[PDB]
Design a protein around this nucleic acid. Structure first.
Ligand SMILES: [K+]
Ligand SMILES: [Mg+2]
Ligand SMILES: [Mg+2]
Ligand SMILES: [Mg+2]
Ligand SMILES: [Mg+2]
Ligand SMILES: [Mg+2]
Ligand SMILES: [Mg+2]
Ligand SMILES: [Zn+2]
Lengths: 128, 216, 97, 25, 202, 97, 91
RNA sequence: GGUGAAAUUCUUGGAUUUAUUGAAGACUAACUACUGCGAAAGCAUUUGCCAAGGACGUUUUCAUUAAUCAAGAACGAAAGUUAGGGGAUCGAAGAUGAUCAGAUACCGUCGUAGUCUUAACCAUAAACUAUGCCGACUAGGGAUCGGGUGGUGUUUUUUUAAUGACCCACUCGGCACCUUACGAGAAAUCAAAGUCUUUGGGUUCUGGGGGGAGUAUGGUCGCAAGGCUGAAACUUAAAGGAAUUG
């Protein structure tokens, strides 16, 4: 087993997707290209086509540095927000695997409270 | 215009001898310069590693161990035990409807001055002929179960060190000890110790770290 | 815990309330247990432990002050120390420590 | 009108009528 | 007299001579007579004790805090005020603190401070209610009371004095570079009017 | 008239329940009300299980799941089509589909 | 017989200074002249000297305190925060 | 960032993201239910004190001590009478950016009073089950919570024992639910909203077409908002409830 491990941290909100690779410790990040700078439209920042384009750019950089395999940790916005991973999470996780990188230990790391502070809207909701 | 990746080393992460696969992985740091070393930049990193990867077996796929870097010597760094946590997949899967979630925790120090907070979890269950569909426990049973769990979780850490605690967190001897002491109150399926946290550490006492390492 | 054990003592057994009676009973050697309130002065507290050490008498520490000790004894004033001379039909001389 | 706001409008009118009663005597 | 907070007289022993050494501390709230006060590097985290600022954990409440090591107390001396320890920076040893004004200061870890809050707090919550009570308060401090308004003066006496009505005439916000005799009003004011907002600006 | 004998949802013996917040618009709605769905999904879709099989170390190890409880207000649940209006006779049916 | 309806101790001020200012003085004056229980001898004998000085007539103990009450809200929260930090240190 | 789209805003002074370490800020997410407690308002992780309570069990005790109650009291959702701290998530307002014919709104970003003090609410809510309380009877069923009783029942281990947990049956007391309609109702529906022209078990409160109007005036609680009590002149042929067809 000569694989060298990184940690691919994927932040999938409904506004943008983050693909972020560090080493085993969270310091010394390797590559981080967001979904919002592969398409310049300000509304397709969370699109799955944007997230897979970003995920190829991490894998091209991770191959250059030397990282061959990765542990992927995926999160949603969390806290008092939606807790549902955005549309870019599934495309970015898939596109890392087809790029030649190896993958192990998929884990959900969405920050989930213990009935913490208040939320959007104010008791009548964001009404539309 | 700098290309900062061609100035970094690679350091091997070494697990303590309480685990089998002592080679965890490799980590980066910058080149040591004038009044900026690499030892002080690596001496606080915490590495999260699955207990399945430390032991090799897939039975420990749902537990992770925090490992904190303490000493660097000769292009590999020696880690110590920093904390154990459960994965979010299993911790959210054992929480099912139509059963009672029982949680007990305690804060206690080891034989060496290692203040830890230990978290335990337990769940009620039906037993093989139950027709009713929830099998809840009364509040007096949960208070009686918590008193037994907290007594076992306290009396065990009094007569052990951090190395002795880590050795017996692997074969689930605590969960069998909780089960044999609470089976006369409720059936109590799915007993686990779900988290230990490092509250206060003692002095560095490097020989205790070298005693944990130094093989292979 | 300690309240109704004391409530068995004052109904049946013998007692003395106060510092001067307690030291007198310790000196003449018929004090089986002394109970010291939490806010008794440390110099006065240290003198009682020395008298108890000399006479081989167990010392219990009340968790509250003189107001709470006199209330648990059953009086309407403040009691700083209480010495038990006879347990009566109470187990306060054995159910300690 | 909504009955909550008709109640609110009556309260302003009741308060300002008392003020007019006050500046005279 | 003239100080809102009470003082505490603490008697030590002279370590190099057979005598006693009486100090005057600003009394912390909870300190009583006959209480033993421990001062030094190895003192414990108790109210009334004097400790170096590097020997206390984060979140400790201190008072009479030295600005420099050895100046015997500069910060948080008035009644009901205190200093919070917010962080340590051990190499090139320093300690970040929060002052009563809300400002953040970095001072040396060797500087000392007394554990607790200054006694006598809540003094200003009582209305003075009378001109005679503000008389007796400033009788023990200095000659600064009562104050005649500048718009009630003649122009010879004040920049604001004069006019057929009582009025300033020009803006009362005065530049920092103005000279003596010109600095009457609001010196170097960044804003005026009623404070519609918050404090601790980022 | 009274549309439902539960007046919405089942309080029936309490008087007050603490409210939850909607997940689509953050409208406060009581916990006895506020339609609840349990969202269990694999963190890789069915179109990626084949993809993730070859690109994985630890061959045929596991595939974990996401566990999420969703709370919906009545307006969001109707608009998101997790619950639709039904006939007066079919309003009484309490069984899941 | 009850002598005043609501002014109480602030009846010595007559009709002056305003009612809202007489109410704030009344609240702090009742605290300031109140008698408090000593934490050393256990008797309700603690009275104020000057502001911040509270002395027990029996047992002769003087405690540094608040201006108009023996202990303030800030000091008790500080005392609990200090104890929690100290027990963390000594553990 | 943020949105239906965008914009305000922050960004080589490195934003966002990652790690480590701290510090203040309702409550206790999942467990959590046609489940529990409480007179109601209301009350969810622990642990320890302090008193309290229902139900059950009872061949203990008193012997009518009771039911409902003008006057008179206690208790209380939250949202502001008033005086320290800590520090914004939401919008009153306020600032702004959109949208629009306008947008002083919905939506976006920020933010002062505003469910955190220790100390009052006069006491207001669709304070709702829009169903007063006490007592008796009338109809079937399966669940569930608390207690009790029985089983030549299961399991836990020492072999079975004692408990506990589970299964079957019964009983008392609860939160409710399902089917019918003898019965009621204008209907919707209802095991009470039944036992009512075959009209009487006891008792308290409220209403008498719609407005004017919870207004005027007087009193009272009231440093406040405002509660509690509370008309008339005049005006009007409908207002309203439930259901049917479009
Ligand atoms: K002038
Ligand atoms: Mg002035
Ligand atoms: Mg003046
Ligand atoms: Mg003049
Ligand atoms: Mg003149
Ligand atoms: Mg001039
Ligand atoms: Mg001028
Ligand atoms: Zn005293």
């Amino acid at each position: 087993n000569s694989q060298v491990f990184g940690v691919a941290r994927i932040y999938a909100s409904f506004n943008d997707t983050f693909v972020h690779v560090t080493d085993l410790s969270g310091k010394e990040t390797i590559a981080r290209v967001t979904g919002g700078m592969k398409v310049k439209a300000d509304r397709d920042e969370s699109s799955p086509y944007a997230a897979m384009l970003a995920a190829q750019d991490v894998a091209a950089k991770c191959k250059e540095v030397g990282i061959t395999a990765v542990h992927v940790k995926i999160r949603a916005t969390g806290g008092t927000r939606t807790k549902t991973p955005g549309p870019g999470g599934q495309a970015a996780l898939r596109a890392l695997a087809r790029s030649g990188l190896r993958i192990g230990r998929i884990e959900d790391v969405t920050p989930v409270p213990s009935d913490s502070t208040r939320k959007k809207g104010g008791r009548r909701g964001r009404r539309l | 215009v700098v290309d900062p990746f061609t100035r970094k080393e690679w350091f091997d992460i070494k697990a303590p001898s309480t685990f089998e696969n002592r080679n965890v992985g490799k980590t980066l740091v910058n080149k040591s310069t004038g009044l900026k070393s690499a030892s002080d930049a690596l001496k606080g990193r915490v590495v999260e590693v699955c207990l399945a990867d430390l032991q090799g077996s897939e039975d420990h796929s749902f537990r992770k161990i925090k490992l904190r870097v303490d000493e660097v010597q000769g292009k590999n760094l020696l880690t110590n035990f920093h904390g154990m946590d459960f994965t979010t997949d299993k911790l959210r899967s054992m929480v099912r409807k139509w059963q009672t979630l029982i949680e007990a925790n305690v804060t206690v120090k080891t034989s060496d001055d290692y203040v830890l907070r230990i978290f335990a979890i337990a769940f009620t269950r039906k037993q093989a002929n139950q027709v009713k569909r929830h099998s809840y426990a009364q509040s007096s049973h949960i208070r009686a179960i918590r008193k037994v769990i907290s007594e076992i979780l306290t009396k065990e850490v009094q007569g052990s060190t951090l190395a002795q605690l880590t050795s017996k967190l692997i074969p689930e001897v605590i969960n069998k000890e909780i089960e044999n002491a609470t089976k006369d109150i409720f059936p109590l399926q799915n007993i686990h110790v779900r988290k230990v946290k490092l509250l206060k550490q003692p002095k560095f006492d490097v020989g205790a770290l070298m005693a944990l390492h130094g093989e292979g | 815990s300690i309240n109704q054990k004391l409530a068995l003592v004052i109904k049946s057994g013998k007692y003395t309330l106060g510092y001067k009676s307690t030291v007198k009973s310790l000196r003449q050697g018929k004090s089986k247990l002394i109970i010291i309130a939490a806010n008794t002065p440390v110099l006065r507290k240290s003198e009682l432990e020395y008298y108890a050490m000399l006479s081989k008498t167990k010392v219990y520490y009340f968790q509250g002050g003189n107001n709470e000790l006199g209330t648990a004894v059953g009086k309407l004033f403040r009691v700083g120390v209480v010495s038990i001379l006879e347990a009566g039909d109470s187990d306060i001389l054995t159910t300690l420590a | 009108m909504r009955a909550k706001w008709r109640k609110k409008r009556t309260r302003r009118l009741k308060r300002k009528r008392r003020k007019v009663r006050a500046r005279s005597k | 007299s003239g100080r809102g907070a009470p003082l505490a007289k603490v008697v030590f022993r002279d370590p190099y001579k057979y005598r006693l050494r009486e100090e005057i501390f600003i009394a912390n709230e909870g300190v009583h007579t006959g209480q033993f006060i421990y001062a030094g590097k190895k003192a414990s985290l108790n109210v009334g004790n004097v400790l170096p600022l590097g020997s206390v954990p984060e979140g400790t409440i201190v008072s009479n805090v030295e600005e420099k090591p050895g100046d015997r107390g500069a910060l948080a001396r008035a009644s009901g005020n205190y200093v919070i320890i917010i962080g340590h920076n051990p190499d090139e040893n320093k300690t970040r603190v929060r002052l009563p004004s809300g400002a953040k200061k970095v001072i040396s870890s060797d500087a000392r401070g007394v554990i607790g809050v200054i006694a006598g707090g809540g003094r200003v919550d009582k209305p003075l209610l009378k001109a005679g009570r503000a008389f007796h308060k400033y009788r023990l401090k200095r000659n600064s009371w009562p104050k005649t308004r500048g718009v009630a003066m003649n122009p010879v006496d004040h920049p604001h004095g004069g006019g057929n009505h009582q009025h300033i005439g020009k803006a009362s916000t005065i530049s920092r570079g103005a000279v003596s005799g010109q600095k009457a009003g609001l010196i170097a004011a960044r804003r005026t009017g009623l404070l519609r907002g918050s404090q601790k600006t980022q | 008239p009274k549309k439902r004998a539960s007046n919405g949802r089942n309080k029936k013996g309490r008087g007050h329940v603490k409210p939850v917040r909607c997940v689509n618009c953050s409208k406060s709605i009581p916990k006895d009300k506020a339609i609840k769905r349990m969202a269990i999904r694999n963190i890789v879709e069915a179109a990626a299980v084949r993809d993730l099989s070859e690109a994985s170390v630890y061959p045929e190890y596991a595939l974990p799941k996401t566990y999420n409880k969703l709370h919906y207000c009545v307006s969001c649940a109707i608009h998101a089509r997790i619950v639709r209006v039904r006939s007066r006779e079919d309003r009484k049916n309490r069984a899941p589909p | 017989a009850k002598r005043t309806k609501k002014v109480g101790i602030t009846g010595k001020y007559g009709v002056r200074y305003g009612s809202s200012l007489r109410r704030q003085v009344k609240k702090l004056e009742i605290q300031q002249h109140a008698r408090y229980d000593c934490s050393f001898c256990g008797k309700k004998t603690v009275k104020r000297g000057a502001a911040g000085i509270w002395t027990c007539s029996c047992c002769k103990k003087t405690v540094a305190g608040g201006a108009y009450t023996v202990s303030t809200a800030a000091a008790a929260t500080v005392r609990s925060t200090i104890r929690r930090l100290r027990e963390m240190v000594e553990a």
